[PDB]
Amino acid sequence: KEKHYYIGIIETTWDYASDHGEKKLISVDTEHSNIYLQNGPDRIGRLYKKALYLQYTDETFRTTIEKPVWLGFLGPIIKAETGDKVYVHLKNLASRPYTFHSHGITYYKEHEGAIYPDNTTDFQRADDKVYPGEQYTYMLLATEEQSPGEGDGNCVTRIYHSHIDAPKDIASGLIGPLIICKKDSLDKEKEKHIDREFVVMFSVVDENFSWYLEDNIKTYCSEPEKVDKDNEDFQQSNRMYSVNGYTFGSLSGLSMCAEDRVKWYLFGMGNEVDVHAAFFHGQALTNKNYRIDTINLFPATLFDAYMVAQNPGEWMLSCQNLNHLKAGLQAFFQVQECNKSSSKDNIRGKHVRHYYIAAEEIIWNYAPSGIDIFTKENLTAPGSDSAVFFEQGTTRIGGSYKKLVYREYTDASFTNRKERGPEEEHLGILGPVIWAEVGDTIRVTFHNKGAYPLSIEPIGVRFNKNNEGTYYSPNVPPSASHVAPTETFTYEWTVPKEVGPTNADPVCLAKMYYSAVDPTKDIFTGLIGPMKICKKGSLHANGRQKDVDKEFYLFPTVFDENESLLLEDNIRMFTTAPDQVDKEDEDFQESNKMHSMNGFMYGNQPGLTMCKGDSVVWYLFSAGNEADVHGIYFSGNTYLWRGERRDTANLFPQTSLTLHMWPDTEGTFNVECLTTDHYTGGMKQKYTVNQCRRQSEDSTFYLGERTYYIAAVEVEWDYSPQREWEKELHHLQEQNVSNAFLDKGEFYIGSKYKKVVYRQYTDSTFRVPVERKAEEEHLGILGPQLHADVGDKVKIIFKNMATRPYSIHAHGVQTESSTVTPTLPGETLTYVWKIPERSGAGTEDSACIPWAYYSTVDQVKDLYSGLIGPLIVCRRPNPRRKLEFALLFLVFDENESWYLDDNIKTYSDHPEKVNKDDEEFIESNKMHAINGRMFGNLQGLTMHVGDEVNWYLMGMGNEIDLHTVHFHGHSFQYKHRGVYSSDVFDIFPGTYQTLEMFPRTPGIWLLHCHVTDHIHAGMETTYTVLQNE
Ligand SMILES: *C1O[C@H](CO)[C@@H](O)[C@H](O)[C@H]1NC(C)=O
Ligand SMILES: *[C@@H]1O[C@H](CO)[C@@H](O)[C@H](O)[C@H]1NC(C)=O
Ligand SMILES: [Ca+2]
Ligand SMILES: [Cu+2]
Ligand SMILES: [Cu+2]
Ligand SMILES: [Cu+2]
Ligand SMILES: [Cu+2]
Ligand SMILES: [Cu+2]
Ligand SMILES: [Cu+2]
Ligand SMILES: [Cu+2]
Ligand code: NA
Ligand code: NA
Ligand code: NA
Ligand SMILES: [O]
């Protein structure tokens, strides 16, 4: 099929909230919509000039093909099937230059529609700047390499947008869907055996970034002269939390029949605030044949889900990022009776699990011992990081808060409790486990003994409209939505086969419950609890899983006590001077942000104990906002998840995960969040693995032995040795051109910083560094790429050539002991890393998987000072050339380096003028690099057509280190045998991933994180595909 589309870019008004009316939303209180939507002398309002893609019939762009009402401002849906040749005839009827750049489809440099320094000449540059009145025809081929995977649906979510300044072009409104499908998937532009196809973009559409910001300020503001574009409140008012451009519940036309087979194409778009949690209330979806209910989306995350629509009524599609929810990121959809036909389960009443739970106020100490169990230091030590959170005095609450927690009782009398045992000691602030099997019916008698109205809203089970735990709509006594301060309601949930684990899932799936009267306050108050939905006949009568020694529930979150219903109470109860407290003081707000695991902090979480050999299942879930970017690292052990070997689990708002671990080493290890602020703020705990069998004289399998000589060495590191690529890009872009990170100006540091980094040496004398070859030029700041095979004992001979104590240690790897010995300056130590089966690929991994190696002495500062490398572990005992590249996506926060003072003194032209606490100086030191290089300074990513390339992506860092790695020109495949495919991979702290690529098309191709703030900050480079012979 040759397909021909005619897309034109017109400027036009967009209404973000096309009333009409009139609504009640979750957690938005009537008189709040108008922060974003109300026209004032100072405020644009709900109407904006935007550049939009429209579809036309004709090379004579005159009569438009109307687009679905639910698309909103997204451009027209383009589709293609493996084999197809799509011709996108673009015509610019707007006032400035734009392009059409497509994801997930093959093009030559003439048809990429993206401008950047690629050493192309004019023939291959017409695509990259289509001027007003110009017209360009993009030839896109749907190659085999870009097609959906074996393990994928028939169709996957892709996107197109303009790419001169992509972030700005997209904010201005030039973004749209491409659905790519397998060969004979489609009949008349619709998937065979699918009834409805919707496309949904979650984005905080930031009109501050639009090309038309100024035009819009003139048009809509009565006092333009009075508008400060840098006023924070002005900026917020132009942030349109929307799905498809529709804000506050106004998305129109999402309608379907019960039993319709619905395929949803979702994607996220935007910036660091775009931590999305897409959640279809009342319904049940699969993704890659797995049961899911929340779909997390980030800038350019591409995601597809299947839904058999059921449980008829009016439901919400919401973002469960609590900030997004309360900023109104909500859309209604309709499941109607028509009349069906089928039904299938049935079971609503037969086998009944009955729970008696009460909300009641306790005084929760986040750290009972008063000590940091990790350091033995105590938490109020003046000047300590913990002090910020545990200091108690004039205007500071400290470490104990009144909270409203769920607690279990034996029966409807609520006269006596179901006490907690050993198995339940780790739950802390969590409520009681609710568990159920496919076929059960859950009835929950909820009795509120708190001063505020609460509810229970479960994720993971089916319930009907008058059992729903939250209230929303498009139009005395107690109900599912409202259970007031002394009342009592009894919920009824069902768990049919349609809502439980699937064949691919494990036996049980981590889920959760919370109070959703106002979930943006209720959860943080304490009303969160763990839940466990399992397959038929999988649990024993007592709830425990068959052949499972231990079951743990971890809930990591920044418990934001500023948002608790009980804030005022806690101020009045714990501060010396309640009247002197400003709830809006940032330092006051920080003091209330309790970074915790199950409400415990700084290693105070008890009850995480097990035997070596035990079968352990970890149920993890989280809630919160954009700050809740978690990487939960089990030091000393790995786990399987969907057949993947990993040791760090990423959680976002309303994420749930089920990990299986079999601990193989006696000791006391760490479960900790690697997200550097969370770690520092006390999101860290211990778990003990005890020796419960006779030791046995063992270690009788070493298929291999390796020694590496590595040194920590202090060096001048330049993030941007040259600035030509940058200067060229901004010229092409017509931009200008303060660089906050590289421009020294009056007194800033610039691009060069003293750092400490890992380097390989030839032998134990450490006199002679291993020469970095052409194929390892790309490593950049990274230490050497260490290789190991499953079965190896790897000796690391480590010399600390730097001026303070450091260590070397690896993820995934097994060692003799839970402790890692620091090695002092001048000293050489030996570390032994064993590589058992569980340090290598799972059933469903690629043959080679990466692990980060790093320094344990101070994990935050040692990392930002520059100590970080890749260990690659491989399975097993004519074809193509096989290449390897390792990529760290990390904002090197040079403010946290040990060498900061050294650097201020060495590079600043006026050291005295530097204030370390000044925001502007802090930004100047946040180096948004790939492998320690910015703006195209990462060299040596070269390959030939026909090669197989393993890309080892590695992410570390802080809350803002969510990186959405995108490759121009080619997509990749992932997982055993290449069964999922994409061209954007999401990387967070702790995420290490192999992606296989089979490059076809010659060129120099852009490779960049797709987060607005990171692209502009320079987190990008190019890679080169060369033709043959
Ligand atoms: C630790 O020392 C602090 C220092 O001010 C002291 O006041 C406190 O009692 C100690 N903490 C505990 C509970 O051990
Ligand atoms: C672009 O061309 C310059 C000058 O000929 C050359 O030195 C450089 O290798 C090229 N850049 C890339 C990314 O290949
Ligand atoms: Ca081009
Ligand atoms: Cu893109
Ligand atoms: Cu969101
Ligand atoms: Cu975290
Ligand atoms: Cu990024
Ligand atoms: Cu792209
Ligand atoms: Cu791009
Ligand atoms: Cu940034
Ligand atoms: Na606005
Ligand atoms: Na506090
Ligand atoms: Na800098
Ligand atoms: O792309």
UniProtKB/Swiss-Prot annotation:
Catalytic residue positions: C673 (nucleophile)
Record-listed Cu(2+) 4 binding positions: H276, C319, H324
Sequence ranges assigned to domain Plastocyanin-like in this UniProt record: 1-181, 190-338, 351-534, 544-692, 704-874, 878-1029
GO MF annotation: an example: oxidoreductase activity
Cofactor(s) listed in the protein's UniProt record: Cu(2+)
Positions annotated to bind Ca(2+): K109, Q124, D127, D128
Matches recorded under InterPro entries: Ceruloplasmin-like_CuRO_5, Cu-oxidase-like_N, Cu-oxidase_2nd, Cu-oxidase_C, Cu-oxidase_fam, Cu_oxidase_CS, Cu_oxidase_Cu_BS, Cupredoxin
UniProt-annotated binding residues for Cu(2+) 5: H630, C673, H678, M683
Keyword Metal-binding on entry: yes
Location in or out of the cell: Secreted
PANTHER family to which the protein is assigned, alphabetical: CERULOPLASMIN (PTHR11709:SF226), MULTI-COPPER OXIDASE (PTHR11709)
Entry's family note: Belongs to the multicopper oxidase family.
Record note on quaternary structure: Found in a complex with MPO and LTF; interacts directly with MPO and LTF, which allows Fe(3+) incorporation into LTF, activation of CP ferroxidase activity and protection of CP antioxidant properties by MPO.
Name the UniProt record assigns to this protein: Ceruloplasmin
Organism (species): Homo sapiens (Human)
